Write a protein that binds this DNA or RNA. Structure first.
Ligand code: MG
Ligand code: MG
Ligand code: MG
Ligand code: MG
Ligand code: MG
Ligand code: MG
Ligand code: MG
Ligand code: MG
Ligand code: MG
Ligand code: MG
Ligand code: MG
Ligand code: MG
Ligand code: MG
Ligand code: MG
Ligand code: MG
Ligand code: MG
Ligand code: MG
Ligand code: MG
Ligand code: MG
Ligand code: MG
Ligand code: MG
Ligand code: MG
Ligand code: MG
Ligand code: MG
Ligand code: MG
Ligand code: MG
Ligand code: MG
Ligand code: MG
Ligand code: MG
Ligand code: MG
Ligand code: MG
Ligand code: MG
Ligand code: MG
Ligand code: MG
Ligand code: MG
Ligand code: MG
Ligand code: MG
Ligand code: MG
Lengths: 203, 58, 144, 63
RNA sequence: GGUUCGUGGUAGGAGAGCGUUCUAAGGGCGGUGAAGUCAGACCGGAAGGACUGGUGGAGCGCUUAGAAGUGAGAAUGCC
RNA sequence: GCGGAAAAAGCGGAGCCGUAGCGAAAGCGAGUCUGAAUAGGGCGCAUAAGUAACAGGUCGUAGACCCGAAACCAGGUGAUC
RNA sequence: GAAAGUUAUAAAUGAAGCGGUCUGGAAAGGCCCGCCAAAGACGGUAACAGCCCGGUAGUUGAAAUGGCUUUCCCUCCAGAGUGGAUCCUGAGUACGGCGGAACACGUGAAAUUCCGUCGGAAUCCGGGAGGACCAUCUCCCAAGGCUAAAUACUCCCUAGUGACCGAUAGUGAACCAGUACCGUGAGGGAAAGGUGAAAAGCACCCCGGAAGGGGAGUGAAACAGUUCCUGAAACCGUGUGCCU
């Protein structure tokens, strides 16, 4: 597919590895990995007090027989107004991983999908002399993005992270850090040639 | 109530029936009141028979 | 991300008892009426037979465990065909190839299947049939 | 926590290749005057756990 | 798409769904009036869902997935 | 566990399950055990599919669907009745 | 003991719209134009604000005290080889019997470790262990002491996070709560959040002793009137279309 520069001009074409960017996407696998990665983000810091954990409750409120009232064991029994919760949330992890091979297939398939749909833009360089958000915004217009976009870069390029930091739909990541959920969260995928090399090197 | 030389004293454990019912009991040390001088001056102190065995003041 | 469709039949809705009679699991919530099995935490322990002497106590204990029990990793002839002709096949080669991962007490060659290639196969043990079959092809079995 | 194996059972049953349980016979200590030699030969052999019993106990000896 | 035989039902098995709170992502509504609330002769096979008008005065749907403190008329239930 | 954003990968093969069973065991092995047996019979093989993860059902250990005793034990508080 | 550095405990500076117009009580909203961005965190502001305010990114800052890290001061300090005459190498100790306990191990064939009691070694030609025990071999040298890190927990402090609660929930406690109240005492132990953007919290008149009303006025609204957002149901009334 085509290879274009920051300015937006064509710079020849580049050949993506068909074992990474060519394979027939496995949608079922991508969905499974997305659900797992969403589940793994959960903090799961939720808790309620059961009848043991609620303050007080110790004594039998009134004698078992004779008073004409329903028999009760504690003022913190669950049917009592301020009483214990019966089950309800307990702190737990929601994290789980599918097997490594399925996780590799998922990233291969989501990246292949982006090529098929023509959402993947392969940039020769992408760098900035100084951190300047105006310049990065202008760059996006030259590439004709005008959506959410994941930017993937290799060379340290500290100025690229800073320049895109304040833009709302835009996420800049290393290339080592490319994940199924990050690619799925963004419409366009802008990648530098140097980053493509690093992604193919892993997959 | 403790050996001044060693530290021998009461320790707990079980009494066991045939049928192996357990109940708590103690083992007291064989402490004897005797005059010795740990400090320069003599004094009546608990000492275990075991501690007296061999070399002691009396 | 707004069009996610998990594989058809991979996920099912859990059954919720005690949520009304329309569902078919209302009121008694699938437990039927009364008795030990209708109660919270109810039910007898696993093998319990309501006081009839359980099966395991009707029948005697048998045997002992050998402290020095050896268990050999088994390699049937068929997998030796994988190797090239006139090859020396050692334990270290069998684990490098990944034919046996853990070498419990040693590697023993068994006859199941047949062998085509000429191989010099060293293992800790061979079945009588193994030795014959390796030699019948034209091999030399060594016992390390 | 892990399920615990029933140790009484682990000392009495053996799992076969097909995954069934093999057992020994009961009446095989003392009182041998009261049993016939035919009974003795039969009781000396192993037996399989019945379907009914297997359903009841299989979790006790998983692993 | 037809044909044939079926379709009372407690315990109970099986299936398909409705609705509630929250999350994600798409796409929307809302001071020209959100949610709630009140009323009605509307719609769907049911759970249920709209529309219109009053009150209300600022938030809330919808689609697809996900997760549950997810549905009450009875407990001499608790307030 | 290292690495890292309470990331994602990558690394990590120790271990686990499966690929062979039979026998109390020594052991032998597509057989093996019993047996004097080349017999018969038991369990196996001839009739390979497993494993990892998630979801449903059910079970086990946990209060384990919720409410309810009379009681038991431990440390205290009471002879202003 | 100094000195230097650094962190903490106050702070400082900090880009860009009073843009036009629509609705409105009010504009941060709609429509139409701009602009800043290492700053589009969060909150506030008369409805929803990167450009109105406090701020935020970035860049600066400490008289004083405390922590930390370096360097200096100060303080302290012998370590290799060769023989084996002799000497030393933890005693009521190890171990054993009896009685207990700890060992996953219930006295068992019961090693190992500890306690009470009684008995009681060897001591380099020595001693212990390898799950009764003996022999061989192997590995170790008890009966003296010290020792950071990797581990446990959180009354606290700082900065954050949540497919956690949202006033019968969440802490018992959003509110002067371990209060009120109950109990001789130990102890038990509540209920109870919302005027409005702003008090502009209703001058004045009228009935009434007052309370409370009705006007008038404020306000977007007072059927928002000092407990005052919404205001369901039970329950209590007035009126009346049809029936009795
Ligand atoms: Mg309690
Ligand atoms: Mg009554
Ligand atoms: Mg109770
Ligand atoms: Mg309360
Ligand atoms: Mg509560
Ligand atoms: Mg269902
Ligand atoms: Mg039924
Ligand atoms: Mg009912
Ligand atoms: Mg019933
Ligand atoms: Mg009955
Ligand atoms: Mg029953
Ligand atoms: Mg009986
Ligand atoms: Mg016998
Ligand atoms: Mg029917
Ligand atoms: Mg019919
Ligand atoms: Mg069912
Ligand atoms: Mg809501
Ligand atoms: Mg309401
Ligand atoms: Mg509920
Ligand atoms: Mg009621
Ligand atoms: Mg008693
Ligand atoms: Mg007293
Ligand atoms: Mg008196
Ligand atoms: Mg400013
Ligand atoms: Mg106007
Ligand atoms: Mg408002
Ligand atoms: Mg506001
Ligand atoms: Mg003893
Ligand atoms: Mg024990
Ligand atoms: Mg010994
Ligand atoms: Mg002793
Ligand atoms: Mg010893
Ligand atoms: Mg031994
Ligand atoms: Mg042992
Ligand atoms: Mg020594
Ligand atoms: Mg409360
Ligand atoms: Mg409320
Ligand atoms: Mg009031």
């Amino acid at each position: 597919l085509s290879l274009l520069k920051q300015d937006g001009t064509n710079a020849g074409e580049i050949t993506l590895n068909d074992t990474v960017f060519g394979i027939e996407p496995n949608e079922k696998v991508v969905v499974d990995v997305i659900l797992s990665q969403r589940a793994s983000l959960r903090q799961g810091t939720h808790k309620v007090k059961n009848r043991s954990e609620v303050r007080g409750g110790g004594r039998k409120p009134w004698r078992q027989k004779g008073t004409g009232r329903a028999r009760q064991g504690s003022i913190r029994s669950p049917q009592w107004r301020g009483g214990g919760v019966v089950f309800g949330p307990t702190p737990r992890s929601y994290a789980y991983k599918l097997p490594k091979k399925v996780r590799r297939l998922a990233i291969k398939s989501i990246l292949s999908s982006k090529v098929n749909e023509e959402k993947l833009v392969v940039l020769e360089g992408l760098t900035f002399d100084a951190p300047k958000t105006k310049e990065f915004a202008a760059f996006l217009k030259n590439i004709s993005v005008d959506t959410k976009a994941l930017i993937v870069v290799a060379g340290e390029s500290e100025n690229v992270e800073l320049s895109a930091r304040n833009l709302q739909g835009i996420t800049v990541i290393p290339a080592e850090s490319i994940s199924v959920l990050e690619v799925a969260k963004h419409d366009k995928l802008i990648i530098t040639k140097a980053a493509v090399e690093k992604v193919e090197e892993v997959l | 109530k403790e050996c001044v030389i060693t530290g021998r004293k009461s320790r707990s454990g079980n009494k066991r029936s045939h049928a192996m019912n357990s109940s708590k009991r103690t083992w007291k040390a064989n402490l004897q009141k005797v005059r010795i001088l740990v400090n320069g001056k003599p004094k009546k102190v608990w000492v275990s028979a075991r501690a007296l065995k061999s070399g002691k003041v009396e | 991300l707004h069009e996610l469709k998990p594989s058809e039949g991979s996920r099912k809705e859990r059954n919720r008892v005690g949520r009304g009679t329309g569902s078919g699991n209302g009121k008694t919530s699938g437990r039927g009426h009364k008795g030990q099995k209708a109660r919270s935490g109810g039910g007898v322990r696993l093998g319990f037979e309501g006081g009839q002497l359980p099966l395991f106590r009707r029948i005697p204990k048998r045997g002992f465990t050998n402290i020095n029990r050896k268990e050999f990793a088994i390699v049937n002839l068929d997998v030796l065909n994988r190797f090239e002709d006139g090859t020396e096949v050692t334990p270290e080669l069998l684990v490098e190839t990944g034919i046996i991962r853990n070498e419990k007490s040693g590697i023993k060659i068994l006859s199941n299947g047949n062998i085509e290639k000429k191989l010099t196969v060293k293992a800790n043990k061979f079945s009588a049939a193994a030795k014959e079959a390796i030699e019948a092809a034209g091999g030399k079995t060594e016992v390390i | 926590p892990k399920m615990k194996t029933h140790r009484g059972s682990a000392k009495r049953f053996k799992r076969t290749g097909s995954g069934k349980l093999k057992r020994r016979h009961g009446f095989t200590s003392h009182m041998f005057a009261n049993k016939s030699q035919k009974q003795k030969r039969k009781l000396r052999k192993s037996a399989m756990v019945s379907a009914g019993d297997f359903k009841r106990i299989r979790q006790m000896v998983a692993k």
